[PDB]
Nucleic acid binder design. Structure first.
Lengths: 33, 173
RNA sequence: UUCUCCAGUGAGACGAAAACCAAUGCCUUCACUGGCAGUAACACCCAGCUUCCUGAACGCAUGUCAUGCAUGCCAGGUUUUGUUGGUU
């Protein structure tokens, strides 16, 4: 169960440090644009 | 990476203990920095293994916290923004106005989850003596034992995250 | 044809994108108020039984009712709309 949380944490940390951030950069452009 | 060990003693022969400890399972020592040992003592960081390092060692002569960071004890445990959680409460057996003002209170007051229970009192009181009195082995609200203790969450933090969240929502579109 | 509550998909004790509807989550207000930022599941008592360019410590950040003493440190090289059911 501890191993299964460790993979939950991991797989969704890498959704934050990729998929969230790069999208945020795009959307944060439109405010100034 | 491995184990930042803090406690004996003061007062230590930290260096002597570390030198002896080399040998497996353990390797890489040195006595450092704020308090009083780091030994690596691989590999999951903090570490899983370190539980053992409690009674193992002393001799000598107390001992032990370990951490990987942050690691003043003050932020995570002691205080922090004087957040509380109130437990048990139940969503269809309460109203938002009911538990709110009965516990000071609050604001901000957001019950979870449903599960059920574990409802942030984002509080003000500040929180010091409030825990001691509403935990109590009582007083019974609404019929359950009522256990109230500390967080270790919030305040302005969540508010800042709401601000960046708000501009992201308006921007997307 | 048990009694304890708050408005009926009620609970507690005891005996590869996106949006329309209802429920339900999370965020926000005060208020189901406005709305998808967040993200295994759960109606307590067991919260997990080398190409090309951007860039550089045992503590920072995520997370803290945690034996979470747990993860995180490279961009290039029929799903989505928060979630399930219904509709388009």
């Amino acid at each position: 169960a501890s191993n299964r949380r460790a993979l939950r944490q991991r797989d969704h940390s890498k959704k934050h440090t990729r998929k969230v951030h790069a999208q945020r950069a795009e959307v944060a452009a439109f405010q100034k644009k | 990476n491995g184990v930042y060990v803090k406690n004996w003693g003061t007062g230590s022969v930290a260096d002597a203990t570390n030198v002896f400890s080399a040998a497996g399972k353990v390797v890489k020592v040195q006595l450092r920095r704020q308090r009083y040992a780091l030994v690596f003592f691989e590999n999951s960081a903090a570490v899983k293994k370190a539980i053992d390092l409690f009674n193992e060692k002393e001799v000598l002569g107390q001992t032990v916290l370990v951490v990987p960071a942050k690691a003043s004890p003050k932020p995570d445990a002691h205080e922090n923004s004087s957040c509380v959680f109130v437990s048990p409460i139940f969503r269809p057996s309460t109203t938002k106005a009911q538990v709110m003002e009965l516990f000071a209170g609050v604001k901000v007051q957001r019950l979870r989850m449903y599960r059920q229970n574990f409802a942030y009192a984002y509080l003000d009181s500040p929180a010091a003596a409030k825990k001691f009195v509403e935990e109590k082995n009582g007083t019974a609200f609404r019929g359950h034992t009522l256990r109230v203790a500390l967080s270790a969450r919030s305040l302005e933090k969540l508010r800042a995250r709401q601000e960046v969240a708000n501009v992201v929502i308006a921007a997307h579109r």
